[PDB]
């Protein structure tokens, strides 16, 4: 294209939004002319590292610290050959929202440190090298989306240049970092407003989708205003990182070779298992931890002081955090209804240190009161969205609440913060946090000695804030999963308000995990994918919610259908019998080939090495968290594979899955609309007014005994 | 073509809470907007609150924000300002005022009109 | 938050005499200070805007001069109806700030 699509007609020019989730954003959007042929130098890229940087007398770090910003997102956007384009994308407060002009004037007041510092070049250099690590380093690639990608640039770099594809820049251009900050004025700004108080006001409907908008036009005084009141407050430009690791060394494996993790500390306090990287030889490292706590479930109210606790606490350090996620090392923080979650990937540079300074902050830490109260409103209003969602997630959502011991509603959890104050809060977490547990993995380029120096560090910084002490082997618990009386069938309804599709989610407690259940639900899911896939969602055409599968859960293996579609749920019901009696006839319909083929389809998609560290880790914490240590189920089940008949599975299906079942541990779930070849008798079901009183009477599961 | 006409200004006593009006005829708030000003009898000057109707960007003084409630109908082009919790020292004559498109052209002004705080 | 030291308090002079008014801001400001006559009993006026800068439909023998934090409005010769309360003010993002008062009167 010749030209570009905004052609004066609708630059210095303003929208007014109507969304349809209630979020607070303002969009700022500058069309910039072409640098695929400035490919060799790339501005752009050192750009958008310095837009949405955070860093010492930064822009943002100031908004963040008057309360101002929430978040915010800006940088280049991609688009056609002739030009392209840079977006700004922020978040808004209260005041956010009545200051915007004021929000635009501080984005030109980082305008003002930028024309006022100039181009620089050891930012440059810093983030060249911090490129040229990272693409000096990489395993190997999924060929999925990576293939897509560099398909995407195919077209335009030459065939050395297709693998350094933007990821090593030979020059620097001042007068185009220059030309593009004069690209940046505000003769240059599109506007778009997003909220949900425009109401009578925004006229002009959009056509396929309906939205609501209106131009009016900024008049000129806040234009002129915008040129001449260019000045700086207490801005600085940030410093050199400090993070960047000369680690690279190898480290030959010991005579400790083992494929699994180790228990190589055991406490009363902690519990440490550990692997080294036989495959990858990577010198990065992951980490994962559980911050075990008995007060974490006992009632709504802590529970909501422990996420606001850990949200702002996360979002504390998080200015400095920038710095290291921008480096290549990536965290997470996450509360459980059992504890906390932490986790630490990346190189081996300073884990120990930065991760010394984490639980230094999150040990000792203090509030500020009207962060406070903007992190206590903002999560208040993320509590009644909740009302809103799609029934497949608030299905899900009762799928495992009544599959738990014991569960707080979101009811209760609206209505309890209406008497969260500071001091009872401040108050509350150190005696909270007076006494706990820590399970922890960690896993790539370490030794085991130096492990043991990590976790020791941890739980010593532990002791020496809070005077930490070790748990009782009797408050070492989980939740418990609820017996049924083995014939019965109960169901209830839930109204959804706002939108006019049904859901509905069908449940089965096989058994505990033994190798043969595993096996058992495996080789059912396996067999009912395709001719769901082919009668339901295609030749019934009910809707494109349909899934079922697997329910590992409190160490009881268990079977689910997620179907959410604008039926009738008795209608929906008898489709669903009636697939059900598909397969009855299906059973028998087996060849020994679809068998064996079926089971080798199973094998092979059960059995793969991993493609990633992350992914076994995930898999490995995924046993952690259920205390299992079954390393090798794999195999095992395997072994198990191969001896299995048809006959086997008709044996499984008469006494526990068919409708003349002894053993039939069924379950149904409603959830109404807005308004709301043979079908046997089922038996009557009753509604379920109270979830306890309903599980009154039910009894509960054993756990397992752990491998 | 320029005309501020605001009025609703009356009698009140201390506690209390009015509400008070600014009709910007001959042009469009959708331009560029007015202020609310303080002025005690006999005293000097206060800026109380300027709203922007094309952006419903509010802009409040720091002793008395939130505690008053501007509000703007832009079919009419007229500004609202509804005041709560009314104090003795309030009663003075207050005016509405226009800024053009300068950098700080505040050049149109309003009738005034009348707040009276009493026993 | 910058506040303003409108100087003199006031002062007395006749018909055609220079009067020379300094309001002082206590920042380092960028001139967005405005300049304003008011009679008793009269809405206000915008004398002099960006504080050296003449709003159309006024008379020139005013003037405004930024200096720094030193703004000040200069009178070359009084007339008969210049007798009133004068002002200046900041104008920011900030909430708009005064000046003291100065009201103009004679020389008797």
């Known amino acids: 294209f010749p030209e570009h699509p905004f052609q004066e007609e609708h630059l210095k020019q303003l929208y007014k939004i109507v969304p349809i989730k209630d979020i607070r954003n303002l969009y700022v959007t500058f069309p910039i002319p072409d640098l695929q042929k400035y490919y060799k130098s790339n501005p752009g890229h050192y750009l958008g590292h310095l837009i949405g940087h955070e860093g010492p007398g930064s822009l943002l770090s100031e908004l963040k610290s008057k309360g101002w910003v929430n978040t915010l997102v800006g940088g280049q956007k991609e688009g056609a050959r002739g030009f392209m384009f840079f977006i700004i994308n922020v978040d808004l407060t209260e005041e956010g929202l009545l200051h915007v002009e004021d929000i635009i004037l501080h984005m030109f007041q980082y305008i003002q440190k930028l024309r006022a510092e100039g181009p620089q070049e050891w930012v440059f250099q810093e983030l060249k090298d911090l490129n040229a690590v990272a693409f000096r380093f990489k395993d190997k690639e999924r060929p999925r989306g990576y293939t897509s990608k560099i398909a995407g640039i195919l077209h335009y770099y030459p065939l050395e240049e297709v693998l350094t594809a933007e990821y090593l820049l030979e020059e620097f251009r001042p007068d185009l970092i220059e030309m593009v900050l004069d690209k940046l004025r505000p003769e240059n700004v599109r506007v778009a407003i997003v909220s949900k108080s425009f109401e009578g006001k925004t006229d002009r409907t959009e056509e396929w989708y309906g939205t609501q908008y209106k131009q009016e036009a900024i008049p000129d005084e806040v234009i002129k205003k915008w040129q001449n009141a260019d000045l700086n407050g207490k801005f600085k430009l940030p410093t050199k990182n400090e993070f960047i690791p000369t680690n690279f060394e190898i480290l030959p494996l010991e005579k400790e070779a083992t494929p699994y993790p180790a228990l190589i500390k055991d406490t009363a306090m902690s519990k440490l298992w550990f692997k080294q990287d036989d495959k990858f030889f990577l010198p990065k490292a992951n980490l994962n931890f559980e911050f075990f706590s008995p007060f974490a479930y006992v009632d709504p109210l802590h529970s909501n002081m422990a996420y606001l606790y850990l949200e702002l606490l996360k979002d504390s350090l998080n200015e400095y955090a920038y710095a290291a996620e921008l480096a290549g090392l990536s965290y997470d923080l996450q509360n459980t209804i059992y504890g906390m979650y932490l986790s630490v990937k990346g190189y081996n540079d300073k884990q120990p240190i930065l991760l010394k300074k984490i639980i230094e902050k999150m040990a000792t830490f203090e509030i500020d009161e009207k962060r406070f109260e903007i992190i206590k409103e903002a999560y208040m209003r993320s509590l009644n969205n909740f009302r809103a969602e799609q029934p497949h997630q608030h299905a899900m959502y009762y799928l495992r609440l009544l599959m738990t011991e014991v569960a707080w509603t979101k009811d209760e959890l609206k209505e309890a913060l209406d008497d969260v104050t500071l001091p009872r809060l401040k108050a509350f977490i150190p005696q909270l946090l007076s006494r706990l547990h820590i399970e922890a993995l960690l896993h790539g380029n370490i030794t085991k000695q130096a492990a043991l120096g990590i976790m020791q560090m941890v739980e010593d910084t532990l002791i020496e804030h809070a005077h930490t002490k070790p748990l009782l082997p009797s408050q070492l618990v989980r939740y418990r999963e609820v017996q049924l009386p083995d014939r019965g069938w109960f169901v209830y309804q839930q109204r959804n308000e706002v939108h006019n599709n049904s859901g509905i989610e069908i449940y089965y407690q096989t058994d505990m995990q033994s190798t043969s259940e595993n096996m058992f639900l495996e080789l059912f899911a396996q067999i009912i994918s395709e001719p769901a896939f082919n009668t339901l969602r295609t030749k019934e055409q009910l809707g494109y919610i349909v899934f079922s599968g697997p329910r590992r859960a409190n160490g009881i293996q268990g079977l689910r259908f997620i179907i959410q579609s604008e039926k009738p749920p008795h209608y929906l019901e008898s489709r669903v019998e009636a697939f059900l009696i598909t397969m009855e006839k299906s059973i028998e319909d087996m060849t020994e080939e679809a068998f064996q083929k079926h089971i080798q389809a199973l094998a092979i998609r059960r059995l793969d090495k991993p493609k990633k560290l992350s992914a076994e880790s995930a898999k490995y914490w995924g046993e952690i968290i259920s205390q299992q240590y079954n390393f090798d189920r794999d195999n095992t089940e395997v072994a198990y594979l191969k001896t299995l008949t048809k006959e086997d599975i008709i044996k499984f299906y008469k006494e526990m899955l068919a409708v003349d079942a002894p053993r039939r541990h069924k379950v149904s779930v409603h959830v109404l609309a807005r308004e709301m070849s043979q079908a046997p008798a089922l038996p009557q079901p009753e509604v379920i007014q109270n979830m306890t009183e309903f599980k009154r009477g039910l009894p509960l599961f054993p756990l397992v005994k752990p491998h | 073509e320029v005309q501020l006409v605001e009025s609703g200004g009356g009698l009140v006593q201390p506690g209390g809470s009015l509400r008070l009006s600014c009709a910007a005829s001959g042009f469009n708030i959708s331009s560029s907007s007015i202020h609310w000003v303080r002025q005690a009898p006999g005293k000097g000057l206060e800026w109380v609150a300027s709203?922007?109707?094309?952006?419903?960007?509010?802009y409040y003084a720091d002793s008395v924000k939130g505690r008053f409630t501007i509000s703007a109908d832009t079919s009419k082009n007229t500004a609202y300002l509804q005041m709560n919790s009314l104090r003795a020292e309030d009663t003075a004559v207050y005016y509405c005022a226009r800024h053009y498109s300068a950098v700080a052209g505040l050049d149109y002004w309003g009738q005034g009109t009348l707040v009276t705080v009493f026993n | 938050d910058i506040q303003m030291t409108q100087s003199p308090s006031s002062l007395s002079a006749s018909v055609g005499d220079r009067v020379t008014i300094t309001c002082r801001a206590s920042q380092s400001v960028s001139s967005a200070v405005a300049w304003y006559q008011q009679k008793p009993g009269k809405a206000p006026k915008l004398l002099i805007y960006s504080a050296s800068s003449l709003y159309s439909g006024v008379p020139s023998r005013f003037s405004g001069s930024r200096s720094g934090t030193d703004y000040t409005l200069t009178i070359s010769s009084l007339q008969p109806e210049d007798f009133a309360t004068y002002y200046c003010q900041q104008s920011y993002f900030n909430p708009i700030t005064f000046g003291q008062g100065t009201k103009v009167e004679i020389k008797r």
């Open positions: 709203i922007y109707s094309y952006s419903g960007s509010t």
